[PDB]
Amino acid sequence: MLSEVLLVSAPGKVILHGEHAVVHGKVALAVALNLRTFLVLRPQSNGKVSLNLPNVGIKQVWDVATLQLLDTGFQLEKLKKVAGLPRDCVGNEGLSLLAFLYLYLAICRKQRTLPSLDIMVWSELPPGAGLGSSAAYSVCVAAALLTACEEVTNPLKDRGSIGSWPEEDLKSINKWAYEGERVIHGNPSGVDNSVSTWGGALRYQQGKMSSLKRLPALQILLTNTKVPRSTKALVAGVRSRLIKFPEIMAPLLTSIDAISLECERVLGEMAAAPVPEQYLVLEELMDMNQHHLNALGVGHASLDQLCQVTAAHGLHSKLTGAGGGGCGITLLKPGLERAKVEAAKQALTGCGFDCWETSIGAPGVSMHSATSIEDPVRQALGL
Amino acid sequence: MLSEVLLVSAPGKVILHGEHAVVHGKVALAVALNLRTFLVLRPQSNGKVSLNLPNVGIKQVWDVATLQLLDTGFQLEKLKKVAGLPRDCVGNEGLSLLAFLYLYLAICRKQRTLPSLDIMVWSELPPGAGLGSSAAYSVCVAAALLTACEEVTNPLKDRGSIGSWPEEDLKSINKWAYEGERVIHGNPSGVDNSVSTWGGALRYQQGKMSSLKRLPALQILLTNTKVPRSTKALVAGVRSRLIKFPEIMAPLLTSIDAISLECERVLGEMAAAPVPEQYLVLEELMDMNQHHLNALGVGHASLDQLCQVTAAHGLHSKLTGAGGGGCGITLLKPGLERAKVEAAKQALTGCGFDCWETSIGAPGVSMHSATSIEDPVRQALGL
Ligand SMILES: [Mg+2]
Ligand SMILES: [Mg+2]
């Protein structure tokens, strides 16, 4: 067990290419989004484990005593049924406390005595926009507990600035993160928590994942049209259009599959020396994938709008994820012109959108010294 | 020879589907556009053949005497070299008088004596927008002369209202029309003059043409962004993008090919009983072909604009032809709402565009009684 205060953070995810085509067996590329989730673990002298989620403004508290006398025994792992009474509240983020409490017991079981902790979670990630926030959250929770119970090595065992876990350690964090995702999503594929853990880019096709080895630095603009949407609804639509127009749609999905592939190849060639001409290839891949998604019928007025304003300032974009609203990605290559992107952000904001100037192909589960944290995150977490 | 005054008209053409994909062997559908070209032939007592083109404000005049003593002898048919001196002016529409004079001699040769005529040509077709105006013009010229020299039957031999030539007659008109197209375009495929002659819809793939047998009534909105463009330039671009991204582009062109095919099939099923749901299939085929053309890189701001305003009023559209400017097609199905299309036209006009509410799948070479002509065309032709 550790006595030190832990501060870990995991990034979000966004589909660069391959969004709807993955359901039909094509390749897709997911990448770490640098809108991180932060978690602060503070050991407690008292005997109560307390979880705090400022955003969803909720902070439940349990006492080691009670939990201590839990008949822990580690279709569907019914253990959840038990855990349901073992605690007491419910709601949207209700499964979040249920995922925690499950990570807590399951992980701190091997501990002679349940430790008294204090967790503070705050993310820059917009909830519900399909940016994988609950994976980043689970990854952050599994990382903090594992390190606390020293089930995994401690990246800041050198008092360094920022640190990460070694491969065999990361594999474990990701294994537990998947559990938490299972209690909250029941049937997650493992891409979200995988992206959140390893960071970078991830190839995904038919259950098979791979981390693109080399990946360049990508600056984008994340835009949330805040337009609600049904994921289930869009996928069904594509499924339909596919049944309705088989010979038109089959080749189209093959075309998207080729975009993800091409992109993957180009990215690997940029990881070497980022020639300016290679950014031109990506912008084109983004324009094309965006048109193909429109052909798939998953576009939206808010999205053609984001793209129209963006091209109005010379930037390229595409929706990311489900489409029909949600978020969009805008590439920002080297050799900008502040005024251009700056005019874009207000233009984008004028439409009633939320716009962030973040990056893609981000790090992954990271441990930070509470001294190398931004003031916003600082005041928020309580540092 | 006839002494009566002749009034023939031929429609223009527009690619419903298949625009750039035809170069790469895919199927394409061309259809008669109801923006007609009118030609008025008046026999003359004097001895001078005079051609008048109000639009291009030019009206040359030759005298039978001179032409009479022409050593007529009927790589490249050098006969044109001769015909060049046999007459005297030159310019843009300079080959037009050269095509005429070539149709005139070549067709009226068998005439014991060159007849003295007076031709008046005026079209509702915008020149240079790729709507095949010179084919319609050639078709009109071949029709009028053939009928005059009675080399072909006379549709108004019954003093009827509107008439057309029988198949074997049309085939001839089209054969001569192709000659005139050859002198003006040197290497025409025969689609333009074919569409202008038979009217309706035309299937075209790899030199092989076919007339779709049954075809429904289609109401559209023709919009000319008046944005200049290089046809040679766009095709090369596609050729390039195709070389650059072979696996992405091949399937895309296969996808467009499937759209033209599907459409052809649907049209044939509408020729029966036009169920409202079938117009929904076309709008979708139009949305998809429009996105694919954007993927091909032949789109333009003026075109995304035409489509944006159009969808803003619930209508569907796609560029037609070269893209990168030029004209766009907007489908207008049964069960409109005047205000909708009406708001669209001004909206479209507001953008500085020329908008027509015409139709597609039009008639073809037709002979009209100078009494069943619109006043605009009336005052214009001099009737
Ligand atoms: Mg998630
Ligand atoms: Mg023509």
Curated annotation (Swiss-Prot), chains A, B:
Q: Which GO terms describe its biological process?
A: cholesterol biosynthetic process; isopentenyl diphosphate biosynthetic process, mevalonate pathway; isoprenoid biosynthetic process; isoprenoid metabolic process; negative regulation of inflammatory response; negative regulation of translation; regulation of cholesterol biosynthetic process; sterol metabolic process
Question: Binding residues for Mg(2+), per the UniProt record?
Answer: S134, E181
Compartment list: Cytoplasm; Peroxisome
Name the coenzymes or cofactors required.
Mg(2+)
Keyword field: ATP-binding, Cholesterol biosynthesis, Cholesterol metabolism, Cytoplasm, Kinase, Lipid biosynthesis, Lipid metabolism, Magnesium, Metal-binding, Nucleotide-binding, Peroxisome, Steroid biosynthesis, Steroid metabolism, Sterol biosynthesis, Sterol metabolism, Transferase
Task: Please give the activity regulation comment for this entry.
Answer: Farnesyl pyrophosphate and geranyl pyrophosphate inhibit mevalonate kinase activity by binding competitively at the ATP-binding sites.
What pathway or pathways are given for this protein in its record? Isoprenoid biosynthesis; isopentenyl diphosphate biosynthesis via mevalonate pathway; isopentenyl diphosphate from (R)-mevalonate: step 1/3
Supply the EC number(s).
Answer: 2.7.1.36
NCBIfam families given in the database record = mevalon_kin
User: Can you name this protein?
Assistant: Mevalonate kinase
Q: What is the species of this protein?
A: Rattus norvegicus (Rat)
